[PDB]
Amino acid sequence: NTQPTIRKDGLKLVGSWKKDEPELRVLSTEEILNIFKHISVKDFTSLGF
Amino acid sequence: KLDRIEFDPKKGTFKYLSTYDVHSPSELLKLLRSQVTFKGISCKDLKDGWPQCDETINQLEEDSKILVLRTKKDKTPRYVWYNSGGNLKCIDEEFVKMWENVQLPQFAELPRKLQDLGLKPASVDPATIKRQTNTHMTGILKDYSHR
Amino acid sequence: MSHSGAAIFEKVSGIIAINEDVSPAELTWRSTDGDKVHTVVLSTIDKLQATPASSEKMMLRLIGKVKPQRHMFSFNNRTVMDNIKMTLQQIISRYKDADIYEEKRDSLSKEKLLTNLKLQQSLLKGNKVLMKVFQETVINAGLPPSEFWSTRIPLLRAFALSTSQKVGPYNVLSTIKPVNKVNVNLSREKILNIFENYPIVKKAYTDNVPKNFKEPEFWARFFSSKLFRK
Amino acid sequence: DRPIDDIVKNLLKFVVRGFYGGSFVLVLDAILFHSVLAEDDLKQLLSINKTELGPLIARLRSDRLISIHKQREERVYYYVKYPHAIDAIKWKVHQVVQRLKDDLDKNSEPNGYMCPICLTKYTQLEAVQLLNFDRTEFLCSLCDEPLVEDDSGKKNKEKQDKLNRLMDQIQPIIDSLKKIDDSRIEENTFEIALARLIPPQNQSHAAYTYNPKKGSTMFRPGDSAPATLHINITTASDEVAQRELQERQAEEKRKQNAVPEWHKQSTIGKTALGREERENEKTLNDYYAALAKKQALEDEFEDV
Numbered sequence: 001n002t003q004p005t006i007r008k009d010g011l012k013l014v015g016s017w018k019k020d021e022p023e024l025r026v027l028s029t030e031e032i033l034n035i036f037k038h039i040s041v042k043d044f045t046s047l048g049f
Numbered sequence: 050k051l052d053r054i055e056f057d058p059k060k061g062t063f064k065y066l067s068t069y070d071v072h073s074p075s076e077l078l079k080l081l082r083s084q085v086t087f088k089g090i091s092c093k094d095l096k097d098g099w100p101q102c103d104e105t106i107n108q109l110e111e112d113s114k115i116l117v118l119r120t121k122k123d124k125t126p127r128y129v130w131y132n133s134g135g136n137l138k139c140i141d142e143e144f145v146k147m148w149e150n151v152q153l154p155q156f157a158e159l160p161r162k163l164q165d166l167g168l169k170p171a172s173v174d175p176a177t178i179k180r181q182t183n184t185h186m187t188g189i190l191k192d193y194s195h196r
Numbered sequence: 197m198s199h200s201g202a203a204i205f206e207k208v209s210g211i212i213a214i215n216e217d218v219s220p221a222e223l224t225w226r227s228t229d230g231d232k233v234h235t236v237v238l239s240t241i242d243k244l245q246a247t248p249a250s251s252e253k254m255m256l257r258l259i260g261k262v263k264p265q266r267h268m269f270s271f272n273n274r275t276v277m278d279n280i281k282m283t284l285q286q287i288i289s290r291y292k293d294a295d296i297y298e299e300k301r302d303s304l305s306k307e308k309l310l311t312n313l314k315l316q317q318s319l320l321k322g323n324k325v326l327m328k329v330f331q332e333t334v335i336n337a338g339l340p341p342s343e344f345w346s347t348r349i350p351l352l353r354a355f356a357l358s359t360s361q362k363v364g365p366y367n368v369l370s371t372i373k374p375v376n377k378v379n380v381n382l383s384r385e386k387i388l389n390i391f392e393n394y395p396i397v398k399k400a401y402t403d404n405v406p407k408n409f410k411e412p413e414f415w416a417r418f419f420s421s422k423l424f425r426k
Numbered sequence: 427d428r429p430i431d432d433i434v435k436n437l438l439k440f441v442v443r444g445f446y447g448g449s450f451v452l453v454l455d456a457i458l459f460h461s462v463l464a465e466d467d468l469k470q471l472l473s474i475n476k477t478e479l480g481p482l483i484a485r486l487r488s489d490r491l492i493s494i495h496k497q498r499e500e501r502v503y504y505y506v507k508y509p510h511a512i513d514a515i516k517w518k519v520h521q522v523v524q525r526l527k528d529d530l531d532k533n534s535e536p537n538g539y540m541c542p543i544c545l546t547k548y549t550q551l552e553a554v555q556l557l558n559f560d561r562t563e564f565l566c567s568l569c570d571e572p573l574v575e576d577d578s579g580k581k582n583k584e585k586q587d588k589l590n591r592l593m594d595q596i597q598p599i600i601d602s603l604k605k606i607d608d609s610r611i612e613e614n615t616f617e618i619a620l621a622r623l624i625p626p627q628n629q630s631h632a633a634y635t636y637n638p639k640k641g642s643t644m645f646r647p648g649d650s651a652p653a654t655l656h657i658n659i660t661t662a663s664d665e666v667a668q669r670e671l672q673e674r675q676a677e678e679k680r681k682q683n684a685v686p687e688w689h690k691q692s693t694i695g696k697t698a699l700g701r702e703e704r705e706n707e708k709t710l711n712d713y714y715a716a717l718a719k720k721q722a723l724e725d726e727f728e729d730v
């Protein structure tokens with residue numbers, strides 16, 4: 001799955017996907033929380049957590 | 050000439066024509082089941098032509114034969130639908146409130162929770178889905194690319 | 197089911213149905229409320245046109261044989277269109293062939309042998325040399341017909357056995373190989389053999405050919421059926 | 427369609443009619459009978475308002491018994507996702523039964539104590555460390571007042587009765603779930619749901635078509651899921667006619683293989699190359715007849 005280009009607009013994080021103008025949508029806080037809860041124990045330890 | 054009046058050649062009379070010819074519960078039950086869509090028939094035009102309908106409509110509501118949408122100001126029947134399901138009332142309010150108290154977990158985590166408790170989940174975490182020289186012959190040669 | 201589905205006709209949404217039970221098969225369009233109804237007989241259709249799978253539109257058209265009668269129907273799912281188109285291909289192809297075809301088109305003894313006048317009239321029509329003698333010796337001369345055949349018994353017997361003999365039983369359906377277009381050739385002898393070897397085919401053939409549809413459709417209908425496979 | 431679909435449809439109908447109000451039955455039953463419905467079409471069909479439809483859809487959306495799908499045509503579409511609804515029903519039913527079972531287990535334990543003044547709950551162990559020096563009454567730490575027994579002794583039977591009644595009433599759901607697991611469940615989608623679409627209105631404004639963006643790598647939250655026969659009958663004169671054709675074809679085949687003329691003979695001496703019965707039959711027929719008497723809109727299209 002192609003990753004988006006993340007930018008911070010105000011207090012919200014907006015990601016833009018490039019097509020095969022690029023699509024843009026707001027990443028909901030719930031979506032980010034769900035993704036963060038799937039990171040493995042070893043994965044985020046390598047990130048310093 | 051009007052479509053709301055019916056002519057009787059037998060005696061030569063003019064009678065009112067109701068939108069739906071219903072003067073018996075059996076007729077209403079069959080008429081409602083014949084609807085090709087879920088558009089309920091209004092009570093305003095049903096009360097017209099049927100001297101008593103609320104008594105019959107309410108009677109069928111108790112028997113779980115039809116569905117009734119009632120007003121909020123005072124109990125008054127409006128557009129009705131056929132009850133394709135079972136009994137209209139089968140569960141006490143002590144469980145409806147409990148059903149309201151229970152809050153589902155995160156959708157993506159629900160399938161894993163059921164698998165851990167034994168029950169087979171009828172879904173998977175959305176993290177698993179994987180979105181996958183010579184020109185004189187020009188205009189004469191057909192492209193036989195494959196056989 | 198493949199005989200019903202949603203369709204849009206003349207800016208009106210409705211349900212399109214395929215009625216096959218009533219012959220000839222007809223295609224009926226009915227609006228959702230039923231206020232509008234349209235029916236087209238498949239026999240009147242020459243070709244069936246359909247938009248390509250690479251196009252957003254789904255207008256399925258049935259052009260009528262002659263400003264040919266055009267009936268355009270719009271679908272929603274490509275799978276539904278393919279399923280409907282596949283079924284319409286069979287009926288259209290079968291009817292097309294029918295139109296093409298329509299436009300394109302014991303008694304072995306002295307006593308009985310001397311009495312079987314039908315046989316006597318049979319061989320005498322075809323044989324020319326005997327015709328020469330028979331006319332001179334029977335018509336004007338007055339010789340009795342029975343006496344004339346007394347000296348020609350072998351000629352009578354040989355001609356009778358030629359048409360009085362039948363081939364032995366054999367597996368007719370095994371020889372029937374279907375061999376898109378598939379061409380299968382049939383003959384009256386095979387048709388008779390099928391009835392003798394299988395009474396069910398004769399039961400269906402006898403009660404349907406004169407009633408509903410012509411024989412060519414029947415055998416085209418029979419082969420496509422699972423009964424032939426069974 | 428598959429019979430299991432009817433089982434799933436019946437299961438959803440029972441749940442709404444028993445565990446939801448009246449208008450909820452109307453909303454979800456309509457989509458079951460029909461297919462994906464636009465919000466405007468749903469209001470027209472049921473004659474219900476946005477302020478009245480909102481609470482119903484919102485509650486049915488939180489429980490995931492009805493799914494939403496937004497696409498640019500921004501239009502809102504509602505449909506049913508069978509795998510999601512079954513899981514939610516299965517979990518909630520299990521949770522509800524578990525909640526009652528846990529409550530019954532908890533109630534079977536000693537009652538406890540409470541203080542009338544400060545209304546503070548005290549357990550049996552907690553009270554044992556607060557009794558007065560005279561060992562006569564339990565004194566509240568905050569209020570220094572005698573404690574009063576809580577009213578939880580007689581509820582032991584009430585909770586059991588509710589569980590017994592609920593299981594009998596929920597019996598159809600349990601029976602339906604057993605069959606659902608036995609069968610194979612196919613996950614539904616907007617495009618798949620369109621295969622069973624029954625138009626709500628003759629001229630609905632909503633375009634019930636799915637035109638995904640071309641070349642789109644976009645992934646939104648929860649928008650992806652795991653010939654002719656011809657015959658020829660020869661009737662007593664076509665086999666011979668067909669036989670002649672084969673003989674003609676054989677003759678043509680032989681001609682196609684025949685060598686040229688110059689190969690037949692050595693062409694050295696030649697110059698060098700360089701620049702009536704019917705009447706008889708009629709009288710016969712009459713004679714036999716006497717004999718027998720004697721004895722007695724411009725668009726792209728394709729062709730398929």
Ligand SMILES: [Zn+2]
Pocket residue numbers: 541542543544545546566567568569570571
């Ligand atoms: Zn106190």
